[PDB]
Design a binder for this molecule. Structure first.
Ligand SMILES: *[C@@H]1O[C@H](CO[C@@H]2O[C@@H](C)[C@@H](O)[C@@H](O)[C@@H]2O)[C@@H](O)[C@H](O)[C@H]1NC(C)=O
Ligand SMILES: *[C@@H]1O[C@H](CO[C@@H]2O[C@@H](C)[C@@H](O)[C@@H](O)[C@@H]2O)[C@@H](O)[C@H](O)[C@H]1NC(C)=O
Ligand SMILES: *[C@@H]1O[C@H](CO[C@@H]2O[C@@H](C)[C@@H](O)[C@@H](O)[C@@H]2O)[C@@H](O)[C@H](O)[C@H]1NC(C)=O
Ligand SMILES: *[C@@H]1O[C@H](CO[C@@H]2O[C@@H](C)[C@@H](O)[C@@H](O)[C@@H]2O)[C@@H](O)[C@H](O)[C@H]1NC(C)=O
Ligand SMILES: *[C@@H]1O[C@H](CO[C@@H]2O[C@@H](C)[C@@H](O)[C@@H](O)[C@@H]2O)[C@@H](O)[C@H](O)[C@H]1NC(C)=O
Ligand SMILES: *[C@@H]1O[C@H](CO[C@@H]2O[C@@H](C)[C@H](O)[C@@H](O)[C@@H]2O)[C@@H](O)[C@H](O)[C@H]1NC(C)=O
Ligand code: NAG
Ligand code: NAG
Ligand code: NAG
Ligand code: NAG
Ligand code: NAG
Ligand code: NAG
Ligand code: NAG
Ligand code: NAG
Ligand code: NAG
Lengths: 120, 124, 109, 120, 120, 124, 109, 124, 109
């Protein structure tokens, strides 16, 4: 039930502890420690900026409009969510991640523009 | 073998209330959505209500929308339905059924997999 | 809600077809059509789901299909044991989750 | 009308100056000043993360689905909002702070799952 | 198509590269470099806070309820969006920035209060 | 003593417009939501419109939704209603009343505490 | 909208009850029921609110209650001075904020 | 000179389908929203559908809402309409028109600037 | 949807006015009224837009105006060649984007 306690659990179970991990991301001699704190903050902010760009700001679970490609992974839902851990999943789809991120960004830009037109 | 057993009420006056319940066994109760399907003595099947496996979301057919409450208890493997104002038109067999929905990370359902035998509810 | 015919019949060994006609924002929009078999006095059994699939536990004599706003159930090597009321149902969106037709009384001759 | 000017006013009045205070949270010799600045940033981010977890991201006033327990405080609305300052209020219920925060987190996690299912 | 590539294009074109610029805002000898990094973070956070105050958190394009005053600029839309760049525009209205920001803040304060009453 | 005094119009032709206003005293005007309640000469009471204490939120009975505007001026302790298209069916006494809504941090209302005397509006 | 009877009456010293029946998404859902007393030619006065409460300024001879979709007003030590048209109203949600019944002409005998 | 040329279908049977297309030239296709306007043989004009300049947003009149699809290809300067279930009531001239909407950073339209000649669609 | 008259007429040199009456959640709410001129057998041409404007390409003899829920088209130096079916239309909100009247047959005498 503590930090990373669900790391060995399946994805569908581990997904219920998202706040456990999110809260553990924030908190010459003494400079290397000062540098570490600054770096940790910059890392954190980049992930938050990215969620913002994709339209997922403020939430831990975000549904999008980008379809899943079978070429990234052709496993079915039971096969994934009730069989694999997140560490295993992350390794399986690592090559195809920077493709997915690009698609999420493009999708949000189109959505924001459409919303703006609908408000004329 | 999956068994759904209704243990409902009997004959009730119009304008009263009646509670049905269904006990389930033979499967992980908590893994499935459940619903109630009604069959009037001279008719076919009608969907009445649907509840999520976690008990948080409920849906109703408009004709009972302000009258029926569907609930769930995952510790006791129990499904229940509380009916109010009992119209004469609500006389029917009420069947306990497994299916009608699934949740996000599960494959889809949208059909009923298992049926109980049904409690008979009669309004005077 | 859905229309399916009364009194579909045939002799043992003959195939029979039970039709189910709905609407566009129904059968024409969602591929979640199922069929149930109800012997009088018993709860219905699932025979077909997701238009063409059958659960383990039933024979392959039962096969579903659809086109346009009409679905159908085909029974091939008809048996005496198939006398039952067959019902079609379909997912019809989020406001009206499920609809059913009346029963089709299948008579074996 | 400046920073903390409303501190002695009642809760129902002070609540109208929330932007005044929010804007005053952000901006070897010289090292202790960098440490203070870095910590001010980490403090700020932890509060923002917490609002995110509770589903209050992006707003100064946020309604939730957690009912108020009479055991935390049994004062009525006039006692709390027409008189009573925020300093007094915070002291009155400081012992229930963690309970309330835990409830808010649980509520949002359930809300996210219900929303996800309603979109599938 | 890269960072600031659209700087010489008109506003109606440049508005489509907002994610290009947003992602380039984040990432004793060595101390002055930390000062620059800490400061860059604080700058970033102030802009995000300001969008939050105005009710534009999480989005790159945000519509508001503050009407445009012809005294700030009396040019028409086909002139501004099609025959002017953002650098030119920024100079044209640099004297009204604080007025506009003040109005946006006031608008959101009223919007939050109205929503709170509707949820009663 | 709390007073609400209508200082409204009189006889108007159909399809025209008529404005009502009400002055308040004896209480903090800005602390209360207000509303207009209508009474046809031979009928009971009908709710017509409601306005928030800060003037930002207004609600109408659907029968006047596209025709009536409700407003407020907290510096002048004044409530007002501007009616357009004046149907003959709108002949009634229009009462100024305090109550009908509250403001989140206040105790609830959902009833009317004070009434004025009523303006008589007649549409030919 | 709400139904309340005409012509409720009784002699001084006798109690009377004026009923008010609404619907489920009305009296049956919200405990925001109030009663008003209108003497002919005068503006209505508040007598009861929040089903059972009375404002300062009115007597304890007036008491409200409810069950199901029906609310009622009880008047105990009826006085000659209680002749008035009594009205019920209720909060009925955000789309239809308030509804009223017709008046009950209470006659003291 | 702006030209909109319909190259539509002909005579079809009820319940089937027909696809229309319109080729545009003389203006930047991508700068304008487009729509279809219908004229029954004995009637006036009726708006049927509207599509945004970028092709992402579409709007329909209720009578064709579940039957018609409007789409664009801005590389080919082509507007098209796919009609299904062809009601007899859909017999009309279908005109290709430019206008009906703007895109936020543009001056507004809400009127039609250009018309094609119209395809005749007949359903038996 | 909109009402405009049939059989409008006058001799060359005489002005004519073609009215168009709608409703409040129509002409009464939005200033987006336009007029089109359709010669028989031809596609419609835009004459007036945004209530009072005319496009380049048309004469100044055509002028729009409005009051209340009524819009109108005034033709001044009427020509024989103005015979056409004139139509009014208006933006009517986001659910029902456009509505039109029937055509007005303008006959020049
Ligand atoms: C998911 O697929 C199961 C069969 O999986 C097989 O082996 C894995 C490792 C992959 O190579 C896969 O493509 C193969 O088909 C089925 O038994 C199971 O029922 C399927 N589940 C769902 C929900 O479709
Ligand atoms: C309301 O509070 C009741 C009293 O328990 C006391 O207060 C809580 C918040 C804890 O601090 C506990 O240790 C104290 O003894 C609870 O029994 C009751 O369950 C609470 N109800 C709800 C709805 O929260
Ligand atoms: C709100 O409370 C006011 C004060 O009530 C008294 O003092 C508080 C601190 C408690 O000790 C309480 O038990 C006492 O009775 C009341 O005057 C006021 O009427 C109350 N509000 C409402 C709507 O009833
Ligand atoms: C619109 O602006 C008017 C003029 O304000 C003055 O000139 C502008 C350019 C700024 O320098 C401003 O600080 C000056 O006070 C106001 O009189 C008018 O009230 C403003 N508008 C609206 C629509 O309310
Ligand atoms: C936008 O304005 C263009 C130029 O108008 C003239 O110059 C500007 C800078 C102002 O001083 C203005 O008052 C002058 O009349 C017009 O050519 C163009 O048509 C206008 N756009 C629209 C949609 O009307
Ligand atoms: C789905 O994927 C198809 C093949 O995959 C493509 O090439 C591999 C090597 C990359 O890893 C993958 O990301 C590429 O997509 C594409 O041909 C097809 O266009 C893709 N469809 C959609 C909708 O994205
Ligand atoms: C580890 O796997 C076993 C099955 O071998 C399972 O019962 C247990 O719950 C799993 N542990 C966690 C943390 O998921
Ligand atoms: C994991 O996948 C295998 C594939 O052969 C399957 O047999 C097994 O039941 C799956 N386990 C779970 C928990 O889904
Ligand atoms: C990525 O591709 C390389 C190609 O050599 C492969 O070895 C590696 O396992 C892949 N990783 C995945 C599947 O994410
Ligand atoms: C301080 O209290 C007095 C009443 O004693 C009140 O009039 C005044 O407005 C209050 N000032 C502030 C800042 O709340
Ligand atoms: C606030 O008002 C109540 C009720 O009159 C009183 O009991 C309480 O002492 C007052 N407040 C404070 C903060 O001391
Ligand atoms: C908070 O807890 C401390 C320690 O038990 C106690 O002394 C104090 O009175 C409590 N405060 C409140 C408001 O209950
Ligand atoms: C620079 O101006 C030319 C016109 O002289 C234009 O075609 C080109 O697209 C402009 N550059 C950018 C980045 O828009
Ligand atoms: C700038 O205005 C002219 C008209 O004076 C117009 O032709 C041109 O298209 C406009 N510009 C741009 C850069 O799109
Ligand atoms: C901004 O104000 C200065 C005076 O401080 C003035 O000289 C300048 O012209 C103004 N800017 C514009 C675009 O008018």
């Amino acid at each position: 039930l503590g930090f990373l306690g669900a790391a060995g659990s399946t994805m569908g179970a581990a997904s219920m502890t998202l706040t456990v991990q999110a809260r553990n991301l924030l908190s010459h001699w003494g400079i290397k420690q000062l540098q570490a704190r600054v770096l940790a903050v910059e890392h954190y902010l980049r992930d938050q900026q990215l969620l913002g760009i994709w339209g997922c700001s403020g939430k831990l679970i975000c549904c999008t409009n980008v379809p899943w490609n079978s070429s990234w992974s052709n496993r079915n839902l039971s096969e994934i969510w009730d069989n694999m851990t997140w560490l295993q999943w992350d390794k399986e789809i690592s090559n195809y991640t920077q493709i997915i991120y690009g698609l999420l960004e493009e999708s949000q830009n189109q959505q924001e523009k459409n919303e703006q037109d609908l408000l004329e | 073998e999956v068994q759904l057993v209704e243990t409902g009420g009997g004959l009730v006056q119009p304008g009263g209330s009646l509670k049905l319940s269904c006990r389930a066994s033979g499967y992980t109760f908590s893994s499935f959505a459940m619903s109630w399907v009604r069959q009037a003595p001279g008719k076919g099947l009608e969907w009445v209500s649907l509840i999520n496996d976690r008990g948080g979301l409920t849906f109703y057919v408009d004709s009972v929308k302000g009258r029926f409450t569907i609930s769930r208890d995952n510790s006791k493997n129990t499904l229940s339905l509380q009916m109010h104002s009992l119209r004469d038109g609500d006389t029917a067999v009420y069947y306990c059924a497994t299916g009608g929905m699934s949740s996000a990370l599960q494959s889809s359902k949208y059909y009923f997999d298992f049926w109980g035998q049904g409690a008979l509810v009669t309004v005077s | 809600a859905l229309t399916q015919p009364p009194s579909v019949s045939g002799s043992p060994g003959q195939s029979v077809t039970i039709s189910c006609t709905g609407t566009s924002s129904d059968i024409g929009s969602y591929n979640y059509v199922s069929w149930y078999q109800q012997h009088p006095g018993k709860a219905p059994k699932l025979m077909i789901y997701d238009v063409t699939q059958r659960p383990s536990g039933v024979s392959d004599r039962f096969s579903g299909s659809k086109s346009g706003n009409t679905a159908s159930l085909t029974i091939s090597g008809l048996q005496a044991d198939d006398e039952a009321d067959y019902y079609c149902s379909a997912y019809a969106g989020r406001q009206t989750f499920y609809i059913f037709g009346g029963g089709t009384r299948l008579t074996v001759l």
